[PDB]
Amino acid sequence: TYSRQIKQVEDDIQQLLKKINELTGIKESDTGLAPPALWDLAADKQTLQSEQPLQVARCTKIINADSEDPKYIINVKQFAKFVVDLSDQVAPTDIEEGMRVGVDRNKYQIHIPLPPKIDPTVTMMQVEEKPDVTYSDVGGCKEQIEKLREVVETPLLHPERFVNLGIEPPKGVLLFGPPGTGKTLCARAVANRTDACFIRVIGSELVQKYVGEGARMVRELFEMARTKKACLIFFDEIDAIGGARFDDGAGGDNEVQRTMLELINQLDGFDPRGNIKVLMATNRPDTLDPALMRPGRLDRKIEFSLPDLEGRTHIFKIHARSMSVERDIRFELLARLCPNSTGAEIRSVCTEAGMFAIRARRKIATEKDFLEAVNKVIKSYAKFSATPRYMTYN
Amino acid sequence: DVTPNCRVALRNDSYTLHKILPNKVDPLVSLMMVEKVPDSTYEMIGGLDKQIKEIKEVIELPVKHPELFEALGIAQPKGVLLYGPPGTGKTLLARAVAHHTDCTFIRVSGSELVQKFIGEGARMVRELFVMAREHAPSIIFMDESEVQRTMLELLNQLDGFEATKNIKVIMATNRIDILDSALLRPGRIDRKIEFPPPNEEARLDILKIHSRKMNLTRGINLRKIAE
Amino acid sequence: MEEGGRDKAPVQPQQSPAAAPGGTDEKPSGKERRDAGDKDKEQELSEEDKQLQDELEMLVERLGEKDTSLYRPALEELRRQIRSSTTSMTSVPKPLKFLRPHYGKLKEIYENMAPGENKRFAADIISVLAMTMSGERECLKYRLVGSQEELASWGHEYVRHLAGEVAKEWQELDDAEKVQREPLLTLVKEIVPYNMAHNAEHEACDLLMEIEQVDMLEKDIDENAYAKVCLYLTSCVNYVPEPENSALLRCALGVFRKFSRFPEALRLALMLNDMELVEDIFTSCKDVVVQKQMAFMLGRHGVFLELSEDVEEYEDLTEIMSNVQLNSNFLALARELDIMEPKVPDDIYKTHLENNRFGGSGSQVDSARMNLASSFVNGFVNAAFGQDKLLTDDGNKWLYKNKDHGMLSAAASLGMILLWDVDGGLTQIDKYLYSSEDYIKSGALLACGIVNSGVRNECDPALALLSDYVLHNSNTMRLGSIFGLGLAYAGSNREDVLTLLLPVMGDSKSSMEVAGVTALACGMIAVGSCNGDVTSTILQTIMEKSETELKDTYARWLPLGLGLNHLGKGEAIEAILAALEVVSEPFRSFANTLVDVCAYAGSGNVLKVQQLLHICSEHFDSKEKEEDKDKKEKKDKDKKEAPADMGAHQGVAVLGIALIAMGEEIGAEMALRTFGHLLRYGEPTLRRAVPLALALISVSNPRLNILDTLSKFSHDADPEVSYNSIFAMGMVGSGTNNARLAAMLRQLAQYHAKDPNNLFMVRLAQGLTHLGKGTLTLCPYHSDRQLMSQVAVAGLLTVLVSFLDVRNIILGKSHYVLYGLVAAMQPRMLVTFDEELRPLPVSVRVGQAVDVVGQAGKPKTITGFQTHTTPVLLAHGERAELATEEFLP
Amino acid sequence: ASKLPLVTPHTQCRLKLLKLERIKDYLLMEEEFIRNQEQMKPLEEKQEEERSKVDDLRGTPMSVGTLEEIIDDNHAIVSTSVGSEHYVSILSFVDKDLLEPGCSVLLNHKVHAVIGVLMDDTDPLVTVMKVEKAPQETYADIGGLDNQIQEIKESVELPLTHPEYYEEMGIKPPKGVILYGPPGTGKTLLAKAVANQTSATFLRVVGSELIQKYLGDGPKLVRELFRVAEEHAPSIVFIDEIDAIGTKRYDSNSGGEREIQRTMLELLNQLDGFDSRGDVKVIMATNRIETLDPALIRPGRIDRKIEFPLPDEKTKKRIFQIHTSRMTLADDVTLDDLIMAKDDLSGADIKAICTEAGLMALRERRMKVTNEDFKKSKENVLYK
C-alpha cells in the first residue's frame, strides 16, 4: 500500500548509517594497518614509551663460552663475531651454547635467550585442526579399528596400565591395502579423536631440489617433535620417500635414499624419540626396504581388505543412512551384487543412486534405482576398476 | 605521471621523491636485441613469390582486413607451419613479414639468458603472453621435441581461451613426418608451406641480390655460375 | 516501428468519448449505449493479466482525462444508470490515469457513487483493477479520515465492508501467498484500532479455511515478534482465538499465551488457563499443555487444579509439580549414566596438564585462591546426580582450613551437586552441617534452598531456613538464610513467607550485606503486585542511601529487586510509578533506568532506547556517573536477545564501534557484558572478537575489568573447542594475569562451559522465543560484577549459585504412558520459512537422524517420519506425548 | 556494512517498516551518541589529529619486511631484506590479526619496529593460469552429443545453480569428472561452453606443462596450484591431456619417470587428501585413457567417466550446418556428398574443410563458396 513510503524511509536511513559512520571514522581504506577506533592504547604514552626507551635488540646466535669467565662467543647473520657478555637481568644458566640471544647494537651484550629455528614449512604441516570423521563412519573393519586404537591412544590416555604391568608399548605402525579402502579416511578418525600435536607428512613434499635438503627437514621435524612430550607423526604414501636401495652403474635415485637413511636414524638408535609415535600408510608395501620394515619402527602392520558381506552391508548403512529412499528396500541384495568392492565404490553407488531419483522428478530412490547404479558403476566402469593389480600390489 | 616500472631520483635523508628517471628498457627490446635476428625485407627475397602470396593470406589479411573474414563468416587463422630444407629463407621471410606489417617479431629459443626477462622462473611458457598481449599485434616464431610441446601449449591458449587477437605463431622446421600427430590434427594447423631448393632461375636472382654490394668488373654472365 | 493498421482502440475510443460531450446532451442513446460499449470493452479488455498494456487503459485518457474531468463533474444531472456506466469505467484506469498525486483524488471518481457491486468487474482480475486502488484508499485516505475521525461517514462506513469483500477476494481468487496481504489490509487499515477490522475478518477467518490458518497464523506471530505497545497489545489478543474459534489445534495455547500473559492482562492467560480447563478433550494434549505450567515458562499454577474431579485428570497437578520433575531427574538417573556420565569425570583439572613441560618446569603456582576454584573440580562437574562419597574431601579439608567464604563455598557447592532433588538432598547436607560454624551452616542451609529448587513441596516454608534466620546475631546466619528461600520459592508467589521476609527489609538493621540481598531475595518471588515490597525497599533506601554518597552495595542490590518486582510490561506506567518515587540526588536517581527498562526485557519500543542513550552519551563525566552510565548500558542488554535476530546484529554492529572502541570508561571497563547477556549461543563473529580485547589484556586499566571480562567471556555454556583459547590464556595466565587475583578466575572461566556435558538450556528462549523466567535468577550476577571488592569477600555468595534456572537440555522424549517408545527423529538447522511454495521446506540438515535422548544444540529444529504424525503439540515443547495413527496404508 | 541481514517479509508490511524504524532510532542514537564526544571533548580533530599522530609515530622511510615467527606480546623476530633479522616490537595500530609467517610488514627506519602490515601484490602465475573471460558461444554451438552434456551440467552446473536438490535427497554431488575418446572430438570444445556457462573462478592447465627441470618443482607447482584453487572460490579446475605426463620423456627433466611418478603421487594426494577440500571441481580430458594410473581413476577420486564417440552421419550434417551457418554458401554444393567422403571424420575435420574452403574463395576474391571449393578442399584437408 505504502510502496514509496517504505522504500525511501528505508533508503535514507540505509544511507544515514554511512553518512554519520563516516563521521565516526572507519574510512580511509588502507594499505595494511588497523581500525582508527582501536589503536588508541599506543596514543600518547606507548608512542614515546614503546618507542623512545625501547631498543631494537638485534637477535644473534651463540657459538660457545669459555671457562672461569663469561667471555662469550657470539655469531650473527653475515657479519663478524665478538666476545660478548650477559646483562644483569639474566642468569648465566640458560646461556647455553648454540643458542639464539637478543643483543644490543652498541655494547653487544646478551639480553634474553631465544628459541631456535623451526623452518616454517615444517610448521605448516602441523594441522592445528581436526576433521569430523567418526569411528562410526569407518565401520566394517572394527577389528582393525580396535587393533590400531589399542596402540594409538591407550598409553596416551592411560599411561599406567602399561607401566604397572611393566611393558613398554610399541611406537610404530603402518597401514596398507588397495586404494580407497579406508586408509586415509581411517586416519581422519584418529586426527578427529586425538588431542596432542598431530603432525602430518606427505612424502612427496620432501622432494627437494638441493642435496641433503629434505634430510635437514627431517632433523628439524624431529627437533620440534622432541620439544613436545607426546606427538603423533603421520606418514602418507611413503613409496615416494623410499622403496629400497638398488644402485648400479650411474647412481640413480641416490638422493631419496639418503633421506630415507636419515629417517631410519631418527627412528632407531642412540637415545631416540622417546614418546613420539609414528604412523605410516602405503599403497604397495612390496616395494618397501627391509630395514625400514624392521620392527622397532613399523611394529603394527595393519591390512585393509574388502569386507566379507556384513562389513559391506554396514558400509551401505553408513553412506545410506541419510538419504531419501524407498523404505522397503534391502541392502543385502546389493552386497550380494558387490563382491569385490570398496566402500568408496559403495558411496559412489549411493551418490549415483540418488542422482537417478534426481533424474526425472523423484524424491526418494527405489530398489531398481539402486540396480541402475549397480550395472553402471560396477559393470559399466568394469574396464577400469583400478583394483586387481593392486590386490597383488603391483 | 608516476608510472609503474619507472626509475626515480630519490633524496637520501628522508627518501623524499625527487625526480622521474626517464625510462630504462622494454623487457622485450632488451632480450630481443640480445638475440639479434637478422632483419630482412621483400627486396632481398630470391624467387619465393607464391610463398609470399600464401603467407600474406594467412597473416597480412587478419590485420589490415579483419572484417574481410566476417565477410565470409569464417574464423581467422592462427598458426603457420613452414618447412623445407634449411638455408631456404625461412628466417628472413618470417622476420620480413612482421617487419612489413609491423608486427612484434618475437621468436623464442628456450634459452636461459632470455629467462630473466620473462620472470624469475616462468614455470610455464605462458608468462610470455604478458609481454605478447602488451605488444598485441605480434608474431611468435619458433625453430625446429620441446619446441613441439611448446607450440601445443601456445595453441591450447589461443584456441579460444585467449581473447586478444593479432598474436600469431610460426614454426619453422624440416621433415614434417616425424613431428606430433596431435600437432597434425587437421583442426590444429592452419597452413603448411613447403620451401623447395632453388631451380636455375632462383639460383640466378639470389646471385643478383647478393651481387649488389660487391665491387664488380664489367661482364660476368651470372647464369653460367648459377648453372 | 509497426504503427497503424489495427488502430481501432486509439481511434474509436478517441472518437466516442470525444463525441460523448457531443452525445450526452441532445443525444440520449449515444450517452448510455456508447458508455456501455465503453464499459464492457474496457472491462473485458482489461480483466486479463497477460496484457497489462491495455489498448485503452493507457490510451484513452490522453483526451479522456480532460473528457472525464468535464464529464463526471461538469454534468450536474447524474442519474441512476449513467453513474453505473460512468463510474464503472472511470474508476478503473484512475490509478494510471492519474500520477502520484492520485492519493488526494481517488474519491473524485469513486466517492461520487461506488457503482453497484464493484467486484462484479473485479472477479477475474487480481490486483490491477482496484485492489491496488483500495490499497491507495487504506494507505492515505483511510489514514486521514481515521486518524481522529474513525467514527465517520462513507469514508469509514462502506469502507469497512469494501475492506471486507476485497479481503475475502484475497482468499477467494487463488488462495495463493496473497493471503498474507490480508494482514497488510487488516493491519494497514486502522493501525491502532486493529480490533474493529479483526472483528470483520475474524469471523470471516472462522469461515475461511482450516488449512489456511497455519501460514497466516505464523504470519501473525511474525507480526507479533515486535510492535508498538498498542499493536503488540492488540494484535496479540486478537491472535489468541484463531486456534480456538476457527482452528481447534488448541495445544499451542499455554506457551504462546505466555506471550499474551503479561502485557495485555495477567487475568487474560488465567482465563486462558480456564480455557485449558474447559477443553477437557483428552489425557494427551491435556497432559502436554499443562506440563509446561511448572518448570518450563512459569509456575504459580499449583492451586487451580484441585477441583471436585480429583482422580487423575485433576490429579495431573501433582505429576506436573514433581513427578515429571522426577522425570527431569530421571534424565540424569537413567539416560545420562548410559551415554557417558561417570560419577567423577574430574579430569578437566587433569586436562590442565602440560604447562609444567611447556617452557621449563612447574611446581610453582601455590595460591590459596586456587583452592577456591579447586572446589569446582568437585562442584561444577557434579550437577545432575554427580553424587560423591568421600570425593568431597577437597571441600572437606578446605572446609576446616581457612577462607570463611570458602566454608560458605564448599558447603554451597553441595547443592549444585544435588540438583532438582527432594529425596536425599536434605540427608546429605546434615553430615557436614553440624560444625557449629556461621560459615559452614549458612552455606549448607543455603544449599538446602538449592536442592529443593523447583520442588516447592513441604521442605522449608518456615521449617529449616527460618530456623537459620532466627539465630540472627552477626554474619551469614543473618545473611545466607533469606537467599535459598527466594531461590526455591522464586517460582512461587506465596505472600505469607514474603511477609516472613518483609521484616528483614523493614528491620533496618545495619547488616547491609544482608539488607542488600534481601531485595534480591524478595524480588525473585513476585514480579507483579505487592507495592508494599517496593515501599519496604524505598523506605530503607531513604533512611540509609540518602545519608551517604558511597559504594554500589546499595546500587547493585537495592533497586534491582524493584526491577524484579516490576519486570515485564511495556505499558510505561511503572516508569511513572517508580521513576517519580525516589526523586532525589542523581546517585539515588541511579535507579531511574532500573525499573524503566527492567519492565522492558523483550518488546519493540526503541523510542525508549533513544531515551536510554541520548541522555548521557559521554559528557566527559569526571568520575561522577560512570556507574549510572554503566548501568545505562546495563539496560541496553535486554531488547537484543529476542528481537529474533533483529537487534543482535544491531548490537554487535554498534557496541564494537561506540563503546569498546570510542569510549573512555563504559566500553573499556564494563560494556562487554552485553556479550554475556545476549548469548551463550556462541558464534565466531563476537566469539573471535572478544579475545582481541582479552588476549590483548591492556593492563593499564583496572585490569580486573578485562579479567572481569575473562570468565564472563567464558560465560558461554554448551561446551566448545574454546579450550585452545582459554587454555592458551591460562598458559600465559600461569605467569602473567597473576594467580593472586585470578587463580579462581581462570579455572572458574575454564570449568564454566563444561559444567557437565549437558544441562545448559539457560538462555530464556523456549519453544521458539518465550521467556521462562531465566532472568530473575541470571541477571543479578551481571549486576553484581561491575568492578571489584567482590572477587574476595562479598560476591562469593553470588559467584557460585546465582543462576540456577537450568531447565535442563533435551527435547527427545517419548512420554507415552508405557514409556517404551524411544523416538524417530531427525535433528536439523533452524528453519528459514516465511512464505514459500508447496508444503514449505522447513530446514535442510537431513544429514543427521536419531531416535533417542540425544543432544539439543542451539540452532536445531527436529522432526520425524514413519507416519507417526506427532499429533500432540506440533510446534516445540520438549515433552510431546507422541501419539500415533496409521490412516495411511 | 553488514548492519542487518534480514529481508524475509518482502512485502509492504509494517514488519519491514518497523525494522528500519528501530534501526532508524539506533543509527540516530549512534549519531548523537558520538556527537557529544566532540561537543564536550573537542581537544583534537580526531579525523586527522590522532591519525597524523600515528603518522607522526611512523617515519617516511618505511622499510618493507617479512615475518618468520610471532611472540604474542607485540614483539617478534622479523627478517630484513638483507637477511640480518632483528627482534623488534610491534605497535598497537598494527591490527594484529593479518599476521602470518612470511607476510610482508612495515618497519621503522630507525628501530625497525613493526609499524604495519603489507597487502601482497597478488601473483603473476595466478593471473597466468587464471582464465579471465568466457571463451566462446554456448552449448548450442556443439550439436550432436546431447547426452553427456546433461552429464556435465549434472555433475557441474546443477550443483551450482540448484543446491536444493541435493539437500532434499540427502546427498552431495559427484566429485571427479573425466573425458576421453578419439582426438579432435570436441573434448576441449565442451569445456569452452562450460567456461562460457559458469560464474565460478575457472582454471585451465595442460597436462604437458606439469613437468619441470627442477626436482620437486612439479609437485611444488601442484601444491601451490591447489592452494590457488582452494583459496579463491567455487572453482573449476580443468586439466587437458594428462596422458602426456606418461607418454613423452623429455631430457629437460633431470629425473626420469621416477620423478614423474612423484609428481603423480603429489597430485594423487591433492585429489584425495585427508584435509578439508572445499568447493573445487575437477574436470579432466585426454585421448589415451588406457595409459595412465588407474589409482587416480578410482571412485573417490573420479566419479564420472565420459567417452566421446565418433560422430554418426546424421549428426555430421548437423555439424556441417553449424560450421556452415553464417557463411554465404553458394547452392552448388551438397553436404551429403561431403558427409560420406570420410567414414570417420571428426568435427575438427568439417571446420577445417569449411575454413580452408573460405581460404580458397579468398584466393579468388569471391564471396560465395562453390562445389569445387569443397572438391579440392578435401584433397587439401584429408589426403596427404
Ligand SMILES: Nc1ncnc2c1ncn2[C@@H]1O[C@H](COP(=O)(O)OP(=O)(O)OP(=O)(O)O)[C@@H](O)[C@H]1O
Ligand atoms: N570402511 C569404509 N567405510 C566407509 N567409507 C569408506 C571406507 N573405506 C573407504 N571409504 C571411502 O573411501 C574414500 C577414500 O578413503 P581413503 O582415502 O582412506 O582410501 P585409502 O584406503 O586411503 O586409499 P588411498 O590412499 O588411495 O586414498 C573415502 O571417501 C571413503 O568414503
Ligand SMILES: Nc1ncnc2c1ncn2[C@@H]1O[C@H](COP(=O)(O)OP(=O)(O)OP(=O)(O)O)[C@@H](O)[C@H]1O
Ligand atoms: N561435435 C562438434 N561440433 C562442432 N564442432 C566440433 C565438434 N567436434 C569438434 N569440433 C571442432 O573441432 C575443434 C576441436 O575441438 P576440441 O579441441 O575440443 O576437440 P578435442 O577432442 O578436445 O581435440 P584434442 O583431442 O586435440 O584435444 C573444435 O574447435 C570444434 O569446433
Ligand SMILES: Nc1ncnc2c1ncn2[C@@H]1O[C@H](COP(=O)(O)OP(=O)(O)O)[C@@H](O)[C@H]1O
Ligand atoms: N630466397 C633467399 N634469398 C636470399 N637469401 C636466402 C634465401 N634463402 C636462404 N637465403 C640465405 O640463407 C640464410 C637463411 O636461412 P633460412 O632458411 O632463412 O633459415 P634456416 O636456414 O634456419 O631455415 C640467410 O643467410 C640467407 O641469406
Ligand SMILES: [Mg+2]
Ligand atoms: Mg588414502
Ligand SMILES: [Mg+2]
Ligand atoms: Mg582438443
